[PDB]
């Protein structure tokens, strides 16, 4: 029979039955499953430092963002994009293709076709759950202990005075695997005193670090996560073969394969310069990048006044509402550019979510 996996070390965010204000630090903020009091109750240590207990039966206060640190894996599978084998963590199987699967990183990282609907297969014992397409679903940003975050020592600190003392600060440079069997479970820190080392952020449910300034850790499809209990769209190899004399390849750039970058530079070397939320600048061949997007916060845009097309465009992105009718032809301001490249536009006082093709720059 099916049973619950008490996956200690799972990286979680708030769930559908959440009623605990901003204990987590807000929606999208990430925490670590420390332990299970019972099959009904779980204790989480949030990245902000607050440790608390939550429901994981009947009511569900938590969604699983990344189970990979628990080491749970689907032997006999492979992610057809990044070629992780076996898939560790949640398994995502394209329902509309023959024998195609993605890992969590690639799934939330918008690999494969966004209009193809996937099955979620959380555990080896799980029955597959058909989902809405990513393209019509809400995407939000993870926040907490990620590259660029400012941290202090956490509760499970057992590393003497490597940080120069309790309360002394450092910078997370990169999320790494504490071990081969537990990916995305560690954070490499460069302390303010020049010391540097790798620390547990999820491994065996341990929390060696605490945020004092959380960082963005990429975007995810919130409603596709199971309840607990500048862009690159080419193959790694095609990207590598294109970089032969236009920047080159170092593994430290892997982030780029699933992260939105801000084109802040061009250069004399017939190439491009991109910065990422990590804080990393990196150089590229023109063919490796695709725009996404052509708008900036503050840009004034006119809403499309062809109703047929805006209906098509908005429905295609799961954002149509008849209430939007009065906005046709109107000029508004780009308030925010979402991770799925849709635009939060302020128009007629109110704000709406638009397909970027449904507006034109004024």
């Amino acid at each position: 029979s099916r049973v619950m996996v008490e996956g200690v070390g799972a990286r979680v965010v708030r769930g559908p039955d959440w009623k605990w204000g901003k204990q987590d630090g807000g929606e999208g903020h990430v925490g670590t499953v420390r332990s299970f009091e019972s099959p009904e109750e779980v204790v989480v240590v949030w990245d902000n430092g607050t440790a608390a207990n939550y429901r994981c039966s009947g009511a569900y206060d938590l969604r699983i963002l990344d189970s990979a640190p628990t080491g749970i894996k689907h032997d006999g599978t492979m992610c057809d994009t990044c070629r992780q084998q076996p898939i560790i963590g949640i398994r995502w199987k394209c329902a509309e293709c023959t024998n195609y699967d993605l890992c969590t990183v690639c799934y939330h990282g918008d690999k494969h076709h966004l209009r193809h609907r996937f099955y979620r297969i959380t555990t080896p014992g799980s029955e597959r759950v058909l989902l809405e397409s990513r393209r019509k679903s809400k995407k939000i940003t993870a926040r907490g202990i990620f590259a660029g975050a400012r941290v202090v020592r956490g509760v499970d600190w057992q590393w003497e005075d490597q940080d120069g003392g309790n309360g002394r600060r450092g910078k997370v440079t990169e999320i790494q695997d504490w071990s081969a069997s537990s990916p995305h479970s560690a954070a490499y820190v460069l302390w303010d005193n020049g010391a540097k080392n790798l620390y547990r952020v999820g491994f065996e449910g341990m929390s060696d670090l605490k945020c004092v300034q959380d960082a963005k850790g990429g975007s995810f499809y919130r409603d596709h996560c199971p309840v607990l209990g500048v862009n690159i769209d080419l193959d790694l190899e095609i990207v590598q073969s294109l970089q032969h004399g236009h920047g080159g390849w170092t593994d430290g750039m892997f982030e780029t394969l699933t992260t939105t970058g801000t084109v802040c530079g061009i250069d004399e070397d017939h190439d491009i310069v991109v910065q990422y939320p990590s804080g990393n600048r990196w150089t590229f061949n023109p063919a490796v990048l695709t725009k996404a997007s052509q708008f900036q916060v503050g840009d004034l845009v006119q809403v499309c006044y062809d109703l047929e097309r805006i209906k098509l465009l908005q429905r295609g992105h799961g954002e149509w509402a008849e209430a939007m009718l009065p906005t046709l032809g109107k000029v508004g301001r780009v308030q925010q550019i979402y991770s799925d490249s849709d635009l939060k536009v302020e128009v007629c006082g109110t704000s709406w979510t638009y397909n970027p093709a449904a507006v034109s720059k004024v």
Partner: peptide, 7 residues
């Protein structure tokens, strides 16, 4: 900041 919830 250890918090204890009850339900």
């Amino acid at each position: 900041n250890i918090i204890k919830n009850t339900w």
